[PDB]
């Protein structure tokens, strides 16, 4: 029966490939060959954030587009005021091996996680003046790679045990476990309607999930190496990847295949962090060769280089109003660009 | 600037002062990473300096504080989190001398020695550990002494053609670990043989990290 099941799986894969190639009638490069190029977008370091003592591994913006959280291997979780270069908080962590951080949309909680296999939720708004651990979520066998907040009570996590999980912070228990990835799941991104999320893993695949149903809807296999970064389009009907094969790729959920590849022959390094702008025209990808690059999303042409970091940039994000990009690197420096 | 913004700047300065004094307190600590196979005597070493994830072992010896880190609970891909340990002072590698035949849990692998050399190739020639020194513990030497007479060393390596005494075979094993890094000028490999009853291994780690600290200070003074 194993041979019959393998033949059925190969037949279904051939059917999926034929249905994907049937919809392919015109590439995105052909249809956007008439739109005007964006130009020569040049940004400058408006602010630099100092105070970290080790490599910064993750950062996340706030909904207010002013507050910034950061995580580093010195066991610190600093909440920054980006406008005035001020330190609102400095949260010591029980485990210094942090790999991810998140900031709640309401601004009341932050999260962190890493090699301690625990997502820790920290309460910022307390009657006492300190920041305390509201909940320690345990249940992942592998290293926690990404965490993102849906609301004040739900947080979705990606881990190194080839599973993604959705938690309930008040109960501190699993709600839905997402299974189907073969390799280590590395990055998460959440749709603006907070009902779907895409996870990129080390099996060179990205899977689209349903939060309320807990099933994988679509699987996107175009890469050749470990996917490290992921982000939706602002529309929610597309997303962009980033892997160690020096290639960013854009996928559409409705077209169910790849639309545009972002690679130059002079770039041989991994990609750590990928983000979009507010309009989605301007794709930003952070690389391992100590600088960020700016890509035009509708036509794969490099329109800028953000070069201000001594070591490799590991995390970057764009504010919700689109007024600033904050790149974080391994030289313990956060820089805000405009 | 407002009064509240001035007080926020003062709060930020207090936070900076606390971070700086925490750095001053933690500058004297030495971070170490312990790596090894399954039954390689990792438990006999952690007991000798003193889904879970990391295990941190803390111990002190003569005005130095050490923080060993065990990554044996992480069964995922090692290449996706080994960059966290790029700034460690040393790597303690534990390999068993009693691995003449010693097939693995798979029960078709050749030797535990070959897996140990494969892990040594993965660690010493890694991209993030180009200049990080290694402390190499060749433990379970009692079983090695009671096992060299019964079984010759040719059952593991079919190139020995030498006497099966304790000293010569142990030196052959140690030298086959040592001639395996192609960065012999920058990093150094310190070797020891542990009988699981010795009480001087902590002194060996202390001496090795003193060597590494002095060599790093000499290097970033530009002396070499």
């Amino acid at each position: 029966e194993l041979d019959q099941l393998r033949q059925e799986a190969e037949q279904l894969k051939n059917q999926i490939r034929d249905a994907r190639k049937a919809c392919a009638d015109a590439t995105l490069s052909q249809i956007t060959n008439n739109i005007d190029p964006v130009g020569r977008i040049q940004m400058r370091t408006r602010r630099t954030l100092r105070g970290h003592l080790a490599k910064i591994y993750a950062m996340h913006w706030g909904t207010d587009s002013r507050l910034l959280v950061s995580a580093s291997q010195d066991g610190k979780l600093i909440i920054w005021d980006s406008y005035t270069t001020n330190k609102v908080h400095a949260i010591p962590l029980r485990s210094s091996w942090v790999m991810t951080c998140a900031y709640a949309p309401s601004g009341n909680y932050v999260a962190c996680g890493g090699l301690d296999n625990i997502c820790s939720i920290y309460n910022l708004k307390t009657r006492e003046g300190n920041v305390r651990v509201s909940r320690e979520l345990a249940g992942h066998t592998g290293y926690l790679s990404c965490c993102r907040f849906l609301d004040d009570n739900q947080i979705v996590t990606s881990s190194g045990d080839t599973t993604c999980a959705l938690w309930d912070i008040e109960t501190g228990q699993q709600t839905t476990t997402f299974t189907g990835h073969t390799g280590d799941v590395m990055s998460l991104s959440l749709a603006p309607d907070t009902r779907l999320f895409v996870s990129g893993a080390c099996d060179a695949s990205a899977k689209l999930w349903d939060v309320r149903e807990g099933m994988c809807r679509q699987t996107f296999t175009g890469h050749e190496s470990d996917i490290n970064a992921i982000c939706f389009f602002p529309n929610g009907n597309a997303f962009a990847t980033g892997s160690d094969d020096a290639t960013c790729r854009l996928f559409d959920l409705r077209a169910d295949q790849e639309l545009m590849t972002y690679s130059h022959d002079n770039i041989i390094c991994g990609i750590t962090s990928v983000s979009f702008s507010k309009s989605g025209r301007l794709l930003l990808a952070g690389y391992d060769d100590f600088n960020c690059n700016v890509w035009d999303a509708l036509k794969a042409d490099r329109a800028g280089v953000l070069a201000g970091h001594d070591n490799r940039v590991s995390c970057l994000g764009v504010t919700d109003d689109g007024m600033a990009v904050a790149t974080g690197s391994w030289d313990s420096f956060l820089k805000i660009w405009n | 600037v407002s009064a509240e913004d001035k007080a926020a700047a003062e709060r930020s300065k207090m936070i900076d002062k606390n971070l700086r004094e925490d750095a001053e307190r933690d500058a004297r600590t030495v971070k170490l990473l312990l790596l090894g196979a399954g039954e390689s005597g990792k438990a006999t070493i952690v007991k000798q300096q003193m889904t879970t994830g990391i295990i941190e072992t803390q111990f002190s010896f003569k005005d130095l504080h050490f923080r060993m880190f065990d990554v044996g609970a992480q069964r995922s891909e090692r290449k996706k989190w080994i960059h966290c340990f790029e700034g460690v002072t040393c790597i303690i590698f534990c390999a068993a001398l009693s691995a003449y035949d010693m097939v693995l849990v798979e029960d078709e692998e050749v030797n535990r020695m070959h897996a140990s050399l494969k892990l040594f190739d993965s660690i010493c020639n890694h991209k993030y550990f180009s200049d990080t020194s290694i402390v190499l513990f060749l433990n379970k030497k009692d079983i090695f002494q009671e096992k060299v007479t019964k079984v010759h060393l040719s059952i593991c390596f079919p190139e020995y053609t030498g006497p099966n005494t304790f000293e010569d075979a142990g030196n052959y094993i140690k030298n086959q670990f040592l001639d395996l890094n192609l960065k012999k000028e920058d990093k150094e490999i310190y070797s020891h043989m542990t009988c699981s009853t010795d009480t001087q291994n902590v002194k060996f780690v202390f001496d090795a990290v003193t060597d590494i600290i002095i060599k790093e200070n000499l290097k970033d003074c530009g002396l070499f």
């Epitope: 005021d81 003046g129 | 407002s2 003062e10 709060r11």
Partner: single-chain antibody
Framework: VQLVESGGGLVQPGGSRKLSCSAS????????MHWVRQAPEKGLEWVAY????????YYADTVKGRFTISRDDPKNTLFLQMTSLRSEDTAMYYC??????????????WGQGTTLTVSSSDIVMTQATSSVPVTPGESVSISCRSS???????????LYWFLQRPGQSPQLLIY???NLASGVPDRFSGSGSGTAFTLTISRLEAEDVGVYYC?????????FGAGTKLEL
């Protein structure tokens, strides 16, 4: 959160007295502390302020030189050393905690206070209304005015609203304009622009009867205003 003050009593003129406040239930080392006076037939007056780390000390013009404010962070105690007491220092002295970061809520908690008795420019905040009659279930607007425009260049208007219930310590309602404090029911609202200010109560109850005080935090020495009273 508890802030209990100690001291008080009948002090002769020209003498000395020390007021000590004990803080329990919060991180005392991360809070800047204040002292606020209240004469028996007058309003609220600001005395002194000590910051976290004791790096910034401020005094009012009336009590400069005579008064010294200090803290002991391991003992969780706040002190106010008073020398050469006149008959204008007869007041109940409140200890107020204040924390300052982006989005913080200064003047959030107020102590019970100790009564002191002695025998024998500045931004003027004006509240022209005083003792207006109220009826439960109605809407009451309390107006506030300032000599200097409190809207800073960063877009923050530093106008603070307080409620003094009869026989009780003051409580914070609105810290910056249209910023409701924690625990305040969501019927109080604040609005204004520059000089003019308003405080609107949607459907007032018997617990909203009291004296409502203005305060500015644009610059020291933190002038209050003569409060407006609500009476049934």
């Amino acid at each position: 959160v508890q802030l209990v003050e100690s001291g008080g009593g009948l002090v002769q003129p020209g003498g000395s007295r020390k007021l000590s406040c004990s803080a329990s239930g919060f991180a005392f080392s991360s809070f800047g502390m204040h002292w606020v006076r209240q004469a028996p037939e007058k309003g609220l007056e600001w005395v002194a302020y000590i910051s976290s780390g004791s790096g910034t000390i401020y005094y009012a013009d009336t009590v400069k030189g005579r008064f010294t404010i200090s803290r002991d962070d391991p003992k969780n105690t706040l002190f106010l050393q008073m020398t050469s007491l006149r008959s204008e220092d007869t007041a109940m002295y409140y200890c107020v905690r204040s924390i300052y970061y982006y989005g913080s809520s200064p003047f959030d908690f107020w102590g019970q206070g100790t009564t002191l008795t002695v025998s024998s420019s500045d931004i003027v905040m004006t509240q022209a209304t005083s003792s207006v009659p109220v009826t439960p279930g109605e809407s009451v607007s309390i107006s506030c005015r300032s000599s200097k425009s409190l809207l800073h260049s960063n877009g923050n208007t530093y106008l603070y609203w307080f409620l003094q219930r009869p026989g009780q310590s003051p409580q914070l309602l609105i810290y910056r304009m249209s910023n409701l404090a924690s625990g305040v029911p969501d019927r109080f609202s604040g609005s204004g622009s520059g000089t003019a200010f308003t405080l609107t109560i949607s459907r007032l109850e018997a617990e909203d009867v009291g004296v409502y005080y203005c305060m500015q935090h644009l610059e020291y020495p933190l002038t209050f205003g003569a409060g407006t009273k609500l009476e049934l």
